[PDB]
Design an enzyme around this catalytic site. Structure first.
Site, PDB file in Angstrom:
ATOM      1  N   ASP A 121       0.811  -1.073  -0.022  1.00 43.42           N
ATOM      2  CA  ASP A 121       0.170  -0.268   0.027  1.00 43.42           C
ATOM      3  C   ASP A 121       0.868   1.635  -0.078  1.00 43.42           C
ATOM      4  O   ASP A 121       2.070   1.676   1.114  1.00 43.42           O
ATOM      5  CB  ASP A 121      -0.976  -0.391   1.285  1.00 43.42           C
ATOM      6  CG  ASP A 121      -1.622   1.001   0.424  1.00 43.42           C
ATOM      7  OD1 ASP A 121      -1.695   1.651   0.035  1.00 43.42           O
ATOM      8  OD2 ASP A 121      -3.049   1.305   2.192  1.00 43.42           O
ATOM      9  N   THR A 122       1.350   1.916  -1.037  1.00 42.09           N
ATOM     10  CA  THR A 122       1.649   2.920  -0.984  1.00 42.09           C
ATOM     11  C   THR A 122       0.949   4.423  -0.599  1.00 42.09           C
ATOM     12  O   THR A 122       1.524   5.347   0.083  1.00 42.09           O
ATOM     13  CB  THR A 122       1.818   3.638  -2.742  1.00 42.09           C
ATOM     14  OG1 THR A 122       1.068   3.635  -4.045  1.00 42.09           O
ATOM     15  CG2 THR A 122       3.071   2.489  -3.260  1.00 42.09           C
ATOM     16  N   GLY A 123       0.181   3.773  -0.271  1.00 41.70           N
ATOM     17  CA  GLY A 123      -0.737   5.245   0.023  1.00 41.70           C
ATOM     18  C   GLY A 123      -0.833   4.985   1.900  1.00 41.70           C
ATOM     19  O   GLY A 123      -1.368   6.227   2.689  1.00 41.70           O
TER      20      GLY A 123
END
Ligand SMILES: Cc1cccc(C)c1OCC(=O)N[C@@H](Cc1ccccc1)[C@@H](O)C[C@H](Cc1ccccc1)NC(=O)[C@H](C(C)C)N1CCCNC1=O
Lengths: 100, 100
Positions: free
Chosen positions: B25-27
């Site tokens: 999850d880059t967020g």
């Protein structure tokens, strides 16, 4: 581009003549923009659940999004999110991959 | 590997002898595991805010995480998250980049 992740992966996007920064988010199924985002026309009620709980949003179909200049069209949610988020529904249209 | 985003980017991880799947999850700034995850020893109270609101979590330092077999060490949060999430604190250690 190739982007490392030492910092939050923000990019500039242009939607309905308005500029904003949004997070490239592989953990998001859907794209959501902040409460003050003004999109014209009809929308459909939706509820989104994250960490913390759920929130009511407006679902707009067939919205043109220019993401780092690339043009894509998809569903955009609008609600009281803390950050603009570009989810996988649009990331796939810009050929976005995770690499390691 | 290179991973496309037509599906949620889950990978198998091993932490403290336990296997689970977790979302790349880059967020996410931080890594968070589900409430049933059992980590030994001292922890520090933290609160995480997502879409929906905030939740109380336990912060565990210097946890060994095996992510697709790679070995990394970092802070891991444990709380009532709907999914296990690998955030940027660990994604940087596996040389994870976004490409498009
Ligand atoms: C930002 C942050 C800082 C510190 C620590 C953590 C864990 C952080 O991240 C928490 C967080 O919710 N980040 C979100 C994006 C974020 C960044 C900054 C502030 C707030 C949020 C997003 O990436 C992951 C989270 C995962 C998830 C949660 C519940 C069910 C399923 C998946 N995904 C979602 O909420 C997405 C939304 C955004 C379209 N989502 C909604 C439901 C259906 N599926 C789905 O994909």
């Amino acid at each position: 581009p190739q982007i490392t992740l030492w910092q939050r992966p923000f990019v500039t996007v242009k939607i309905a003549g308005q500029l904003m920064e949004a997070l490239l988010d592989t953990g998001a199924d859907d794209t959501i923009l902040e409460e003050e985002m003004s999109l014209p026309g009809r929308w459909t009620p939706k509820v989104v659940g994250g960490i913390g709980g759920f929130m009511k949003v407006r679902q707009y179909d067939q919205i043109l999004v220019e993401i780092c200049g690339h043009k894509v069209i998809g569903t955009v949610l609008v609600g009281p999110t803390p950050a603009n988020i570009i989810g996988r529904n649009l990331l796939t249209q810009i050929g976005c991959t995770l690499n390691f």
